[PDB]
Structure formats: structure tokens, C-alpha cells
Design a protein around this ligand. Structure first.
Ligand SMILES: OC[C@H]1O[C@@H](O[C@H]2[C@H](O)[C@H](O)[C@H](O[C@H]3[C@H](O)[C@H](O)[C@H](O)O[C@@H]3CO)O[C@@H]2CO)[C@@H](O)[C@@H](O)[C@@H]1O
Length: 563
């Protein structure tokens, strides 16, 4: 109980960031107080709240959180955080409406005494921000912002840094954002992760790592990127003898390390663990919930591969239902909630829960992964909610960077997924050893430039069917979407798409290879698109349903407009 206090409860100071701000922007209140509490992370010991009300009478109950300021520096190859000042409490709010808001601060400590502030008035003006990310009501396959514009995630996993910490995100994120990226995923566990909140304890959260997460979230805000926060990873509940990067022996949850659990199975039902997990959720909502740059709360990385002694499907299902209900009830902004599985088809008993707003796939597969992706995307349409291919790579023991230095595997997956009806791109692993050093960002820029001018929410896109190839010298395959105005095609050479030795294509496209006929009413306009340079190659108006296929080396995109 490092941060305990034993004084009579009193507010000592309040600092307010700004009294005027824009819609969806951060409004931050700093609260200095004294009180009686053993653990500032436990609302039963001290409960700080901000109560906000808009001019329409809508109320927001925002939990406050304990905070330490730091100043970062780089000591050769590692980030070091110097504490600045005493820790204190903060409230972070974001207005969804414009106009005036009134708010006050309330604090209650373990004695039951309550203190409060005067009522303050702030004023909110219109801004450019599109709002929070939600499921689209127009097409359940996709996400939208509150303002109605689509959110198509394009990006990769960027889940932890090296010892350089936030200084790595300073490098990776600008490169991603300048190349069409608007998405990444970070891990808040296990305890070795850059942003690990439960580092030494499951009862108190790590203020240094929380500050690093603030820093990275703020960078995402400046770059218009949106983050999935993964709260826990399977390693925490996996025994050493079980392999796969196990961490149970080292995790703070285990009684050996000060936690409540005698074995990982007890995580799902242990009353003390459940209480502290809810405190962690409250801390995460308090500290990060305001941000429209939080795309989603993800409970678990690959919960199905915790120790088999600990995976009880009915218990894991009930825990997800209960935690999703709790998280939704305390999150004033109702961020999306998800969870993930290592097994590519997922766990229907969990994926079907209404509290999980979208489903995911993880897939590491070396052979015929294009067909595997299409098959999984077709299968998961049964859930009638968005599908994110949240992890993808070869099944090559992490050797993707040697097998495919040009990123053709990633290239094939991002085109296949976005033109098969997934909510966004397949999300690659290997951000630090592959995507960045091999400079693979250009693949994303080319795809973003192809999709960004179409409102996917309104096209009524369906997986392409009813096509017929007429090609004699090559085996060409297609992944496609057919909509009310556009047909989007990704054509690939089956004999070249899975070979990765040749250099990035850079050829002429003057020869006729063959044709593809589609079920559509002409006249149509056809645009041929180089998927490596990210540029239009050729435009052609046609009065028949037969699309000529121009020469290409590996793959080619075609955008067809019904006129
Ligand atoms: O260096 C940080 C940390 O790394 C841990 O090991 C990582 C591996 O380095 C590798 O990235 C591995 O990736 C998995 C990941 O689990 C993911 O969910 C997905 O299923 O597949 C990838 C590709 O295999 O992830 C582990 C962590 O699970 C570990 O070695 C730590 O000791 C070390 O600090």
C-alpha cells in the first residue's frame, strides 16, 4: 500500500485544462486531495467521480483515476521515466454534444465521508472529429464513426515496443499514418508488455506504463489512428510446462507472486480476482475511455490457449457476458468490446454473445491462406456483426521476414480480406522486425487509396459470385465484391502469388491475358489499378459484361463502375 493516505477527506486543489473545447476533445480535470485510503486504485478505498450534464439534461458519470506525471528520456537504448511532482487524481471527459455542460467533482473515501466541489460550466464548440467508432446500422459487416462516415481499419498489430518504449511508437506510428494506416493494437498484459497495468500486482496498476499508454494514445490522436486495447493475454494463464511463451509462474495473479489465485482455472470465478478485474476495467475507462481514438476494448488475446486445466467453456462464456455487461455499464462512451481466439474458427459459444460487438480471427497459415481467409470470412457472416482478421501471418515459426522480405504475404492478405467482406485489412504480426525494417508500409498506402473513396456502408457489397474466367495460358483467380454501383476485383496468378523470391513487380501492362465475365448490366467503366505502385493503370468504357484482363505479374485490382 505504497500510496496510502490517512488524513481527513478534503479536496485541496482543482486545476482545469481549458473551459472551452471542441466536440469529442479531451477535457481534463486535476484533483489534489487528502483522505483515508489504502489503495487509490480501489473504489472501495477512494472513489473520485466527475458528474457532467449537457444542456439537454443528459448525464455522464465519469470515474476518476490516480495519476503520476513523468518526464521521459532515452538512456542509450532504453526509455527511462523520471517522476515529476506528487501523484494526484484526474478526470478525463469528452463531450459528444456541443453547447454548455455543467459538472462537479465528488469524492468518497473508506470512512464513508463525501466531499464535493462547486459546479463548473464549460462550453463546447463544433469540431472536425467524427466521434466514436460503432457498428454500422447500414451494413453489419462494417464500422462507422458517430458522424456516419465509415471506419475501415487499415493497419497492423503494433502491440509492444523494445526497451525504447514510447520512442519506438514515435517512429512506427508516423510511418503507418502517412501510408494510409488508421489502426493498431496494443497489449496491456502480460506483465512484461510495454503498457502492462498489472505489472507487479493485480490490486494496484503501474503508473509508468499507464503514462506510456497515455503518450501513445495522444500520438494516435494527432495522427488520426484508432487503437484496440488488449487487456490480457493467454500467457498469463498458461503454465511453463505447456510452452507457447507461458507466463503463469511469473504473473501477479498467482498466489506465489502475491495474487489471489492458486491455479489459472480460478481466474474465472475467484471472488477477489473478479473484484480486482472490475477495478482494472474502471481504471481503464477512467484513464482512456474519453478517447475517440480507442477503437475497441478487447478482453483477451487468444483465451482458448490458456492452460487446458483452466479453460472451462461455460465459465469463460459467463465471465465474458458479465464483464462485457459491467464494462458497458461504467463506460460513458460505450466503446466496442471484443475478445480473441488462437483457433481460427473461434468459439461460437463466446463469439455469439451480444455483449461482444464484433468477432475476430487469428490465422497463421503458410499454404493457400487466400482460400483460408475467404472461407473464414464467409463462415463468420453467421454472427451478423463485423469481423476483424486481427492477427495474420505465415505458419513459419516467425521466419516471415526471411521467407518474404517484400511483404507479398501481407499484401495478399490485406487485399483478400478487404475485398471479401471483412471489416478491414488482415492485421499483420511482425511490426518491429519485418514491417518497419523491410519498409512494407507502401502496401497499405496502395490499398487505402483504392478503397477510401467508396462508401462501403451504402454499396450493399456481396462476395462476388456468378463469374466465369476465359483464360488459356494462366491460372488466374479472383476475390471480389459486387455492389449496387461498384464491383471491386482483386485478380491473382495462382502460380505466382505464393512465391516470394522475385522483386516487386514493375512491368508493362499492354498485353491481353484473358477475360472475366460478370453478372452485370452495362454500360460500365473499368479502372485497372496497380496494387504495388498504388495508381490507376488504365481506364476503359465497355458496353458488354466481359472484362478484359490486362497483363500483370502477380496480382491486379480492378474497379468497375456501373453507369
Ligand atoms: O519481446 C517481448 C516478449 O515476447 C514474448 O514473446 C512473444 C514473441 O516474441 C512473438 O511475438 C509471439 O507472437 C505470437 C503472439 O502470441 C500472438 O498473439 C499471435 O498468436 O501469434 C504470434 C506469432 O506467433 O508472442 C509472444 C508473446 O505471446 C515473450 O518472449 C516475452 O518474454 C518477451 O518479453
Amino acid at each position: 500500500s505504497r500510496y496510502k493516505d490517512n488524513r481527513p477527506l478534503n479536496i485541496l486543489g482543482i486545476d482545469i485544462s481549458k473551459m472551452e473545447l471542441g466536440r469529442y476533445n479531451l477535457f481534463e480535470v486535476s484533483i489534489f486531495l487528502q483522505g483515508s485510503y489504502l489503495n487509490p486504485f480501489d473504489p472501495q478505498e477512494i472513489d473520485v467521480e466527475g458528474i457532467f450534464e449537457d444542456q439537454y439534461g443528459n448525464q455522464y458519470r465519469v470515474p476518476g483515476f490516480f495519476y503520476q506525471e513523468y518526464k521521459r528520456e532515452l538512456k542509450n537504448d532504453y526509455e527511462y521515466l523520471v517522476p515529476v511532482g506528487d501523484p494526484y487524481f484526474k478526470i478525463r471527459f469528452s463531450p459528444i454534444n456541443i453547447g454548455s455542460y455543467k459538472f462537479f467533482i465528488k469524492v468518497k473515501d473508506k470512512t464513508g465521508r463525501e466531499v464535493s466541489s462547486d459546479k463548473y460550466t464549460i462550453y463546447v464548440k463544433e469540431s472536425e472529429k467524427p466521434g466514436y467508432i460503432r457498428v454500422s446500422e447500414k451494413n453489419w459487416r462494417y464500422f462507422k464513426f458517430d458522424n456516419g462516415r465509415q471506419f475501415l481499419p487499415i493497419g497492423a498489430n503494433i502491440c509492444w515496443a523494445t526497451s525504447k518504449g514510447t520512442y519506438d511508437y514515435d517512429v512506427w506510428l508516423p510511418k503507418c499514418a502517412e501510408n494510409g494506416g488508421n489502426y493498431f493494437r496494443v497489449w496491456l498484459g502480460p506483465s512484461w508488455a510495454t503498457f502492462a497495468l498489472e505489472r507487479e500486482s493485480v490490486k494496484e496498476y503501474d503508473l509508468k506504463n499507464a503514462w506510456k499508454l497515455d503518450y501513445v494514445l495522444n500520438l494516435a490522436e494527432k495522427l488520426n489512428m484508432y487503437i484496440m486495447f488488449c487487456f490480457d493475454s493467454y500467457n498469463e494463464l498458461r503454465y511453463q510446462k505447456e510452452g507457447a511463451y507461458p507466463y503463469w509462474e511469473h504473473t501477479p495473479h498467482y498466489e506465489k507472486n502475491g495474487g489471489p489465485l492458486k491455479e489459472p482455472k480460478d481466474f474465472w470465478t475467484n471472488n477477489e480476482m473478479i473484484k480486482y478485474y472490475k477495478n482494472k476495467l474502471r481504471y481503464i475507462v477512467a484513464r482512456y475511455g474519453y478517447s475517440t481514438n480507442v477503437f475497441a476494448w478487447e478482453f483477451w488475446n487468444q483465451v482458448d490457449i490458456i492452460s487446458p486445466t483452466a479453460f472451462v467453456i461455460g465459465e469463460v462464456k459467463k465471465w465474458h457476458e458479465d464483464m462485457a455487461k459491467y464494462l458497458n455499464s461504467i463506460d460513458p462512451w460505450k466503446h466496442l468490446i471484443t475478445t480473441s481466439f488462437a483457433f481460427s474458427p473461434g468459439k461460437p459459444e463466446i463469439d455469439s454473445i451480444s455483449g461482444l460487438n464484433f468477432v475476430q480471427t487469428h490465422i497463421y497459415k503458410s499454404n493457400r491462406y487466400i482460400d483460408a481467409l475467404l472461407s473464414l470470412i464467409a463462415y463468420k457472416e453467421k454472427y451478423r456483426k463485423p469481423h476483424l482478421v486481427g492477427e495474420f501471418g505465415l505458419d513459419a515459426g516467425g521466419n516471415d521476414l526471411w521467407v518474404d522480405p517484400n511483404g507479398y504475404v501481407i499484401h495478399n492478405a490485406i487485399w483478400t480480406t478487404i475485398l471479401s467482406g471483412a471489416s478491414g485489412t488482415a492485421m499483420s504480426w511482425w511490426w518491429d522486425n519485418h514491417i518497419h525494417p523491410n519498409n512494407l508500409y507502401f502496401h497499405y498506402r496502395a490499398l487505402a487509396d483504392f478503397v477510401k473513396d467508396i462508401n462501403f456502408l451504402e454499396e450493399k457489397f456481396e462476395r462476388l459470385t456468378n463469374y466465369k474466367f476465359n483464360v488459356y495460358n494462366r491460372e488466374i483467380k479472383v476475390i471480389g465484391l459486387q455492389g449496387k454501383k461498384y464491383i471491386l476485383l482483386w485478380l491473382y496468378n495462382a502460380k505466382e502469388a505464393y512465391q516470394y523470391k522475385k522483386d516487386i513487380p514493375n512491368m508493362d501492362s499492354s498485353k491481353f491475358l484473358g477475360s472475366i465475365e460478370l453478372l452485370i448490366k452495362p454500360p460500365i467503366k473499368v479502372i485497372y489499378y496497380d496494387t504495388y505502385r498504388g495508381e490507376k493503370i488504365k481506364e476503359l468504357d465497355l458496353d458488354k459484361n466481359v472484362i478484359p484482363i490486362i497483363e500483370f505479374e502477380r496480382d491486379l485490382a480492378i474497379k468497375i463502375e456501373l453507369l
